[PDB]
Design a protein around this nucleic acid. Structure first.
Lengths: 121, 52, 252, 233
RNA sequence: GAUGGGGAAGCUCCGUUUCAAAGGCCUGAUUUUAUGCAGGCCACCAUCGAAAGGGAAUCCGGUUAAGAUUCCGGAACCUGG
RNA sequence: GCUUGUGACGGCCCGUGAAAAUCCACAGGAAGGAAUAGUUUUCAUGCCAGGUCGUACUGAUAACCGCAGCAGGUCUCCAAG
RNA sequence: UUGACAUUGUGAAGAGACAUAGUUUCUUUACUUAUUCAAUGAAGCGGAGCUGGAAUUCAUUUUCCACGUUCUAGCAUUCAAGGUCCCAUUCGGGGCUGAUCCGGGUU
C-alpha cells in the first residue's frame, strides 16, 4: 500500500493509552482515621486576665489550637463544638509553639455567656 | 489596565491603542498607492510580454 | 613557583566576558532556500549600540517563509545603512551596500563585511569597526573565491559563502586617544577583567619568569619557543623577528 | 461565478507563506529508525563477501508458494491434536493394548536449527528451507555449505516468521522435511528440481561473486552522468 | 542545578535544551456515562537563585502594663467564584 | 529659602547605562446571535470568598561582632530657629 | 612535538618480485560507508520533464541557460480562493487540482 503524509518534520512522542492502577492488593490495610477532628483542632481555652478582658468587651473566644490547622479548620471546629456562628478568625503563634486563636463570635451570639457554658470564669 | 473600562485604552479609529493616527495615515496612503502601483507595473510588463 | 596570570585566565572565572548588556550574537540569516536560490527582503528597523563592541549593530526584520510570523536578525550595521532601508539576501540580489551575496555573485573588487569562512556559519570575517574584506578573484570551476582579509592575508573560501556589501561603521574609532586611565577603565569595564596589567618584571620569581632580581630586568631572552609549555610562554612568543620595524611593511 | 473570486497565490520566494507540503522526506526520525536504516545502507555500500550474499538471493513468489503449500501439508501437532491423540492412546493401549503403535507414523516439517543440522549430516532430510533474515547471520550461513557437502537440496526462503507459521512458532531459522506421504511423493521432485536450479547447482558460481558495494543515488547520479560527458564530446 | 547522555576504578565529573520518540490547552465529541478522542494551535523544556530589583489590592481615628497600616470604629480597594 | 518629588531640556562617553513573571491594546475574522423577540456582564448595582508563616524588643560608648555592660567595628530613611 | 603499528575500507595512473602474464607493496588522485567539523522547530535536496528562448540548425535537435517577488518604513495566517469530483443534500464535510513527475541520502 502507501506510506504516511507528514506536514511536519518533527517526530513527536506517539500518544499512547495511559492505563490506570488496579491494585491486586491494598495500599494500607485500614485508612487512617481523621487526623484532625475538631477535638484535636482546638486544644484548650486561653484564660488570661487579658484573654477574659477579650471575652468581656470583645465577644471573642480565645483558644489554644493545633498548629496543624488553619483558619477554616478553627472556624468549623468552634462552630460544631460550641454551637456558634463565627464572624472572623485571627490567629498567631505564641512564643512556645502554640496557636492562639482570636475567634470573634457574630453579633447574634455572646461569647461572655458562651464561656460560663463551657466552664471558665 | 484590567481594572478599567475599554474606552480608557482606545481611540475610536482603527488602530486605537496601538498606532497614532498620523502613523495610520501613512499606513493607509502607503497601502493604497502601493496596491495601485502594483497594477501599473503589471499592465506595463504585460506590454513587455505581449511585445518584445 | 606560583601559577602565572596568563595561566589563570583560561580557567575562566573572574576573566570571562562581561555579557549582561550585549544586544545578542550578531550574525547573518540562516542559509535557507530563500537565500539559496533567490533573494529575500528585510527592513533595518533599528541600528543600535552593542556594549563592548564599538561597531553598531543593525536590527533587521524578516518574514518567515513557512509560518506567518516575523523573524528578527541581528546584523553588524555596515557603513551607511539606515533605518527603513530594505535589505536583500541570497544569490540573485542587488549589489548595494547592505545586501548579502554569496561571494560568487560579486565581481573582482567588491567589499563585504561579516563574510563566512565555510558557507552557512552566519558570518566570521571582518566583523570589527572599519574592517572589510576585498575579493581579488574567483575560480568558477571548483567554485572557490579568494579574498584579502583585514590582516592582508590571502585566503580562499567557497563562492557559495556569504558576505554583506560595504565596510563596517564606527571607523577610525581607534584614532582618538584614550587620554586617561579611566577611559581605558570604562572600556574594559564592558569587555573583560584584563585591565590594568602589571609588568612581570615588577613581580617575584614565584609570580613570573620575568619575576625577580635586584635590578628590574627580563634576565633572559624574551622570545619564547613555540614548543614552550604553560607557565613558560611570556614575552614575545615564537617571534620570527623582533625590534623596531624600520621600513614600509604591507604584505608582499 | 457569483460573489466568488479567483485569486490564485504566489508561493515564490519572498511572498506568500508556504503551503503545507509533504515533508516526509525530511522529518527527524527517532534514532531507532536511523540506526535500522543506515545499517541497511552500510550493509550494501561495502563489498560484501560471497559466503554472505549467496543469501539475499531469495526464492521467488511462485515456487515458494507451492513450497509453502507442500509444507503446510505437514504441520506438526497442535496442542489440542496431541491431547486428542493423547486420550486416543490413554483410552486405548491401556485396554485395547497395542505396542504403543495404536497410533500412525507421523508426517510433519522438521524444525529447530540444531535438529535440522544433524538431519543434514545424517543424510535424512530431503528439503531445507533456510530463512534469509536470521539476524545473527552466523546461525544459518553454514547450511548452504553443509547441504551441498552432504548432497541435500536446500532453498533460502524469504520469511523467518513465515517459516514459523507453518510450524506453530513465531519464528524459525529453518524448515525441513525427512518424510513425505506417498501422495505428495512425486509432487516433491518438481519443487526440489526447480529449487536446485536457483541454489544447489549455482552455489559454486555464486561462492566467488562478491556482493554489494552498491552506491546510493545522489552519488550514483554523480558518476552516471560523469562517464557520459568527458567521453562523448 | 537535576533529566537524555558522554566522562571516570569509583566517590563522582562534564553538560542545561544540550547528538532525546521530552509535553498540554481549548472544548467538542455524550444525551449507553462519564470521560474516551474528533479537529485544531503550541514545540513554548526542569528546577533553585533577591524580606534593597520586578510586583494585584488600605487609609484615617481610637485603644494596650507591653500589639497594631494586623484589634476596634468608620470609610475603601483587589483578586478568585 | 530648605528638603523632596516631577517635568521639559541640555552636557557627557572607544562607558550610550538588566532581565523575567505579569497586565493591557491592536491587526485578524474562526464563529455566534432578533421581531415578536434575541444580544449583551470590559456599563451600573448585587452575593460569597481571601490559606500558610513572620509580626514583641535592641540595632548599639549594655541587647549584634570584638573572651566583657570593651573609647574599636557594623548598611539606611525623617531632620526646627 | 615527530615515527611506527591498530581504528583502515574502495577504485584508477605510475613504480616494486618469481625475474615482460597478477596475488601482494607504495608515490600522484579519485570513491563514500567508518571517523571528523557545521547549521536548521532535519523545508523545499538529487534525478527527469513542462514551458521559455539565446543558440546554429549540417537532420531534427547535436545543446547551454532562465523557468512568480527591487522607486515607498503599508498589508501577506484559518488544511486557500478559483476549478471540479463525491454524500444522496443542512447547517456541514472530504477528495483531486490549485502547487509536474521519480529516489525516501535533512543539507
Amino acid at each position: 500500500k502507501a506510506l504516511k503524509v507528514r506536514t511536519s518534520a518533527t517526530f513527536r512522542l506517539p500518544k499512547t493509552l495511559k492505563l490506570a492502577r488496579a491494585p491486586k492488593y491494598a495500599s494500607k490495610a485500614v485508612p487512617h482515621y481523621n487526623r484532625l477532628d475538631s477535638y484535636k483542632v482546638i486544644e484548650q481555652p486561653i484564660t488570661s486576665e487579658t484573654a477574659m478582658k477579650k471575652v468581656e468587651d470583645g465577644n471573642i473566644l480565645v483558644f489554644q489550637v493545633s498548629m496543624k490547622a488553619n483558619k477554616y479548620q478553627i472556624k468549623k471546629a468552634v462552630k460544631e463544638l460550641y454551637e456558634v456562628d463565627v464572624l472572623k478568625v485571627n490567629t498567631l503563634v505564641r512564643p512556645n509553639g502554640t496557636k492562639k486563636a482570636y475567634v470573634r463570635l457574630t453579633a447574634d451570639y455572646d461569647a461572655l455567656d458562651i464561656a460560663n457554658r463551657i466552664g471558665y470564669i | 489596565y484590567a481594572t478599567v473600562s475599554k474606552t480608557h485604552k482606545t481611540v475610536s479609529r482603527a488602530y486605537g491603542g496601538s498606532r497614532c493616527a498620523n502613523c495610520v495615515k501613512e499606513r493607509i496612503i502607503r497601502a493604497f498607492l502601493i496596491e495601485e502601483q502594483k497594477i501599473v507595473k503589471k499592465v506595463v510588463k504585460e506590454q513587455t510580454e505581449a511585445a518584445k | 613557583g606560583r601559577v602565572i596570570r596568563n595561566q589563570r585566565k583560561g580557567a575562566g572565572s573572574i576573566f570571562t566576558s562581561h555579557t549582561r548588556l550585549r544586544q545578542g550574537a550578531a550574525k547573518l540569516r540562516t542559509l535557507d532556500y530563500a537565500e539559496r536560490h533567490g533573494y529575500i527582503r528585510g527592513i533595518v528597523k533599528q541600528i543600535v549600540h552593542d556594549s563592548g563592541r564599538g561597531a553598531p549593530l543593525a536590527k533587521v526584520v524578516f518574514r518567515d517563509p513557512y509560518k506567518y510570523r516575523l523573524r528578527e536578525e541581528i546584523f553588524i550595521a555596515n557603513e551607511g545603512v539606515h533605518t527603513g532601508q530594505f535589505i536583500y539576501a541570497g544569490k540573485k540580489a542587488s549589489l548595494n551596500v547592505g545586501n548579502v551575496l554569496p561571494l560568487g555573485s560579486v565581481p573582482e573588487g567588491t567589499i563585504v563585511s561579516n563574510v563566512e569562512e565555510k558557507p552557512g556559519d552566519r558570518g566570521a570575517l571582518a566583523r570589527a569597526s572599519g574592517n572589510y574584506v576585498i575579493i581579488i578573484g574567483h575560480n568558477p570551476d571548483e567554485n572557490k573565491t579568494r579574498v584579502r582579509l583585514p590582516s592582508g592575508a590571502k585566503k580562499v573560501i567557497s563562492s557559495d559563502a556569504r558576505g554583506v556589501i560595504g565596510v563596517i561603521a564606527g571607523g577610525g574609532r581607534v584614532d582618538k586617544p584614550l587620554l586617561k586611565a579611566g577611559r581605558a577603565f570604562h572600556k574594559y569595564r564592558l569587555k573583560r577583567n584584563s585591565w590594568p596589567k602589571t609588568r612581570g618584571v615588577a613581580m617575584n620569581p614565584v609570580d613570573h619568569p620575568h619575576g625577580g632580581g635586584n635590578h628590574q630586568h627580563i634576565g633572559k631572552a624574551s622570545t619564547i619557543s613555540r614548543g614552550a609549555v604553560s607557565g613558560q610562554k611570556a614575552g614575545l612568543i615564537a617571534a620570527r623577528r623582533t625590534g623596531l620595524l624600520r621600513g614600509s611593511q604591507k604584505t608582499q | 461565478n457569483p460573489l466568488t473570486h479567483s485569486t490564485p497565490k504566489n508561493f515564490g520566494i519572498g511572498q506568500a507563506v508556504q503551503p503545507k507540503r509533504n515533508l516526509s522526506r525530511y522529518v527527524k526520525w527517532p534514532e531507532y529508525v536511523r540506526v535500522q536504516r543506515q545499517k541497511k545502507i552500510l550493509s550494501i555500500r561495502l563489498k560484501v563477501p560471497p559466503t554472505i550474499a549467496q543469501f539475499q538471493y531469495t526464492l521467488d513468489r511462485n515456487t515458494a508458494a507451492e513450497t509453502f503449500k507442500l509444507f503446510n501439508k505437514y504441520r506438526p501437532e497442535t496442542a489440542a491434536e496431541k491431547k486428542e491423540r493423547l486420550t486416543k492412546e490413554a483410552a486405548a493401549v491401556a485396554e485395547a493394548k497395542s505396542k504403543q503403535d495404536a497410533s500412525p507414523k507421523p508426517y510433519a516439517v522438521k524444525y529447530g536449527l540444531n535438529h535440522v543440522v544433524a538431519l543434514i549430516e545424517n543424510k535424512k532430510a530431503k528439503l531445507v528451507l533456510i530463512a534469509n533474515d536470521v539476524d545473527p547471520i552466523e546461525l544459518v550461513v553454514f547450511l548452504p555449505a553443509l547441504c551441498k557437502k552432504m548432497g541435500v537440496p536446500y532453498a533460502i526462503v524469504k520469511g523467518k516468521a513465515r517459516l514459523g507459521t507453518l510450524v506453530n512458532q513465531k519464528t524459525s531459522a529453518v524448515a525441513a522435511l525427512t518424510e513425505v506421504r506417498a501422495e505428495d511423493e512425486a509432487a516433491l521432485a518438481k519443487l526440489v528440481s526447480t529449487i536446485d536450479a536457483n541454489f544447489a547447482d549455482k552455489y559454486d558460481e555464486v561462492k566467488k561473486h562478491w556482493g554489494g558495494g552498491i552506491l546510493g543515488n545522489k552519488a550514483q547520479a554523480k558518476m552516471d552522468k560523469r562517464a557520459k560527458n568527458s567521453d562523448s564530446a
